[PDB]
Design a protein around this ligand. Structure first.
Ligand SMILES: [Ca+2]
Ligand SMILES: [Ca+2]
Ligand SMILES: [Ca+2]
Ligand SMILES: [Ca+2]
Ligand SMILES: [Ca+2]
Ligand SMILES: [Ca+2]
Lengths: 185, 185, 185, 185, 185, 185
C-alpha cells in the first residue's frame, strides 16, 4: 500500500481538425486515451506500475495546455469515462455525442486556446485495478478512458474555416496513486 | 452517489404450469428474471439506470402477489442467486433443484395463492455493478437473478391435477439503490 | 385554517370485467375517480367543501374492500396520480399501463377479494387547491385522481375465464383535510 | 423528494449575427431557451425528468463558453425570465429591450469571446413545477426561460462590421434539482 | 424580496343606488375591484408593480370613508373574495347574495355614512402572484377581488326612498407587500 | 426608508473616438452621465424613483464592459464627480483634464478592451437628494455625474491610428439605494 504523488506525466499531443476532416460524429473524437497507471509507455507512472500488482487513482486529473495563439478558436469538451467498454465511436448524432460528453462528471468545456482540467471521478466502492497490459476484460485493468470531443468548427482570426488540421496543445496527467502488493510482473 | 428509493416497479406475470408441462427438473423454473437496475425495459428504475455508470441495490425485494382463487393450489419456492453464472437449468434431480433453491439466503416457500417476498442478499464487500446492457461477463453487470421454482403439482379444488397452465400472479420489485457517477451511456 | 378529520366517505362501487370486455389497454381502467374535496356529490366531505375557499389533503387514503368470495380472482393495481392532466387512457401497451401504474408512489397491487389501501402522496411544496367545481385548469382544483387498473383475467374457481363483468367491491376515502378561508361559494 | 446534482448538461449552440441580420429589436434575441427540467431532449436531466411528477431548480446556472478568437467582438446580455408568459419578442425599441434585459436579476453582460454565467433566481415561495411536456399554461411547467440578447455590432479585428452570422459559442446548464413524487408519466 | 409599506393608495369612488336602479341581485354589486398590486392604474403601488416579477400582499385592507351626511342611510356589506373566478354576478336571490357576502372572512357590514375597513385574508400556503396585466388565468395574477354589496334601500332623513343614485364615498387601500425578483416586464 | 438593491441597470453605449475627432481637451469627454436615481429614462431604477421624495445611493458602481476585440487599444480614465456643478468641459490642457480625472476618488484607468468599475464615493454627511427632474440647482438633485475621459490615441493592431470613431462598449450601474418618503410626484 504505497501512495505515490502528487506528480505529473506527459500523455499526448492533441490535434484540432478542420471542418473537412469531420464527416461523422465519431470524427469529433480528437483523443481517446486509456488511463491505467500502465498505459503511457515511457512515462514515470507507467514505469512504476510494473512493480505492484494493482493500482487505484486517488486523483488523476487531465490537464490540457494550449499551443495555439488567440487568433484561432475551437471549442472542446473533455471528459473521462470510468467504463472502458462504453464507446461513443458509434453514435450517429453530433449533438448526442457532445451531450453524452458534458453529462459525464467532471467534464469540462473550453476554447482550445486556454488551459483547462478534468478530474477522473473516483468510484463509490473501493475498487483497485490490475496493473500492466490488458488481458481478457478492460473493466479489470482500465480505471478510465479520457476523451476530447471537438464541438465546434476550427475557425480563423476572421471567423472563416481553417482549411487544415492543427496540432493545438498537449495533455498532461497530474496524479496521486495507491499501488498495492509488490510484484515484478 | 445518489440514493433512490424506496420505490416499486413491475417485473413480469408468472405462470404456474400443469403436471403435463413439467417433464424435467428444468421445466420447474417458472421465472428467471435478471435483477440489474437496467434489466426491466419500460420501468422507472431501468429508465433511471441509463444516467449513472454503476449501481448497487441496498434493498431489492421481489414481491409475488397472487391472481388466483383459494380453490387452486401450487407450492413455489422463490430465491435470488447473487451469481449470475450459476445456472440450475441443468440439474437432473427434482429434489436437488428445490434444495439448491431453499438453501439460498432469503429464499422463501409458499402456496401460490398468497403474497410473499424475497430479499436480495447484499454482498459482504461493497461491490458496485455496471449499468446498462451486458458486455463480456455477467458478473460485472448482474447483481442477481430471481427464480421461481415450482415444487408441487398444480392442483384443483378437489385435489385433482389441473390440465392447463395458469397465469397465476405477478412480480413486483421494491427497491432502494445507490447509483454512482453521472453518465449518459 | 380548519383541520377536519380523520373521517370516512363512500366513493363508488367497482366492477371487475371479463376478458371479452377488455379489448385495449384503456379498457383496463376500472375506475377513474377525481380526488378533490369537492368531487363526491352527496358525501360529507364534499358537503363541507363548499364553505372554505381552498383545501389540502393531509392524508387521503383510498380503501378498497371486497364484495366477492375467494372462489374468484382478479389482480388490480391501484394508484393516485397527483397530476390531473396526465392521462393513461391513451397508452397502447398493456404492460406499459401497469408499469406506469405501479411506479406511482403509494401504489399498491392486490387480488380483488382482499381489502387494501393506497395513500395520496402529499406535495413537497405546501400547495392548497381551489374547492368547488372545476374552472379553466384542473391543476388548480384536483389534488389528485385515483385509478384502479385491472392487470389480470377475471378467473373462476377452476382457473377458467368468467364470462360476465362482476361488481366486486367498493371504494372508501379515509381523509384528513385542512380547509382555508371561510367562503360560501 | 430526491435531490439530484450538482451536474451539467448541454443546451445549444449560439450564433452571433451580422448587422445586416438585425433589422428589429426582436432580431437581437439570439437564443430563447425554456428551462424546465424537461425541455432539453437527449440530455441527462430531461431523461430523468420523466420519472417524477414535479421539479424545482435549487440552482440552475446557464454557462456560456466561447468558440471564437479575440480578434472578433460582440457584446451580449444574458438573463433568465422566471415568467414564461412575458415575452420581449415584441418591444419596438433597442434600448428598451436591453434595459429590460439587464434589469432581470442575475443578468450578466459580456463580450462574446469570454466565458460567463447567469443564475436562475429562485422564487420567494416554494413553488414546484410540473415535469414533462407543456399542457394548458406555461406557468405550471416552465420555471424559467433563458435569453441571450445581442446589444452591439458583431465587429472584426479592425472595428469593421462582420458581414456574416457566426456560430460563436455554446450553452451549458449546471444544475441542482429537487424532484418530487415518483411517476412514469 | 422587497417589503414595501405600510402605505396607502386611492381605489375608486363608490355610488349607492336608488331602489329603482336595483332590479336584480346582481344590481346590488356597487363595486367589483380586482386587488392585484397591478390593478389600479395611476397609483403608486401599481406603478411599483411593474418592476418585480411577482407580489404577495401581507396586509391589504380596503378602507371605505363616507362622503355623505347623517341624514341619509344605506347599509353595505364589503368583502374580498380570494378566488377571482368565483362570481356572484349570477345569483338569483337577494338574501343569498348578502349571505355569501358576510360569510367571507374579514367581511364587514355598515351604514354608508361611516368609515369601515375590510382586510384581505392571507392564504395558508405562501403563494405569490404574477405582477402585471392578466394572461390566461386570473388565479395566477389576482390575489383577490373586493366587493361592496348594497343590502338595504337608500333612504332619506324621513325614511322615504331616495329617487336618485348618490356617489357616497371613496375606497382606499392600506397595503403591505412583498415583491420578488426584479424584472421590468 | 426603503432599501432597494443590489440591482443593475443599463446606462449608455460608449464611443471611443479617432485622433481626428479630438481637437481640444473637452473632446476627450466620451461620456457625461448624470447619476440621480431619476436620470436614466426607461430603467428600473428611474422607474422606481418617481415614488419616493428623495434618494441616496449607498453603493452606485459604474461598470464598463467592452465590445471590442484585443486588436485595438485605447486608454480611458473613468470617474464620478460628486459635485454636479463642477465642469471640466472647459479646461485648456490635456494633461490637466486627465489629472483632475484620476485624482477623484474611486477613479480607475484602463484599456478599453477590458471590463472595469468605478464606485461613487459616498458623502461624509448623510445627505439625501431630491428625486425626479432637476429644478433650480443640481446640488439638490444630482448625487453625482459619471465621466469617461479618453487619455490615449485609438490605435489598431499595428500601432497605427484608427481613422473612424468606434462604439466600443457599454455602461451599467450596479446600485443600492435608500429611498425616503412615499410620494407620486
Ligand atoms: Ca499483473
Ligand atoms: Ca456503462
Ligand atoms: Ca371557489
Ligand atoms: Ca406529469
Ligand atoms: Ca410578468
Ligand atoms: Ca419631488
Amino acid at each position: 500500500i504505497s501512495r505515490l504523488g502528487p506528480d505529473s506525466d506527459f500523455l499526448t499531443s492533441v490535434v484540432a481538425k478542420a471542418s473537412t476532416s469531420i464527416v461523422t460524429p465519431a470524427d469529433r473524437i480528437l483523443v481517446k486515451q486509456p488511463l491505467s497507471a500502465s498505459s503511457f509507455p515511457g512515462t514515470r507512472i507507467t514505469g512504476l506500475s510494473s512493480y505492484w500488482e494493482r493500482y487505484k487513482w486517488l486523483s488523476a486529473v487531465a490537464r490540457y495546455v494550449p499551443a495555439v495563439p488567440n487568433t484561432v478558436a475551437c471549442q472542446f469538451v473533455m471528459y473521462i469515462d470510468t467504463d472502458p467498454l462504453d464507446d461513443p465511436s458509434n453514435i450517429s448524432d453530433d449533438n448526442q455525442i457532445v451531450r453524452q460528453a458534458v453529462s459525464q462528471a467532471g467534464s469540462n468545456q473550453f476554447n482550445f486556446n486556454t488551459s483547462k482540467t478534468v478530474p477522473l471521478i473516483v468510484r463509490a466502492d473501493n475498487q483497485y485495478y490490475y496493473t500492466g497490459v490488458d488481458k481478457q476484460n478492460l473493466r479489470f485493468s482500465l480505471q478510465g478512458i479520457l476523451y476530447i470531443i471537438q464541438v465546434t468548427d476550427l475557425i480563423n482570426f476572421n471567423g472563416e474555416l481553417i482549411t487544415q488540421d492543427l496540432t493545438c496543445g498537449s495533455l498532461f496527467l497530474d496524479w496521486l496513486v495507491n499501488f498495492s502488493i509488490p510484484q515484478i510482473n
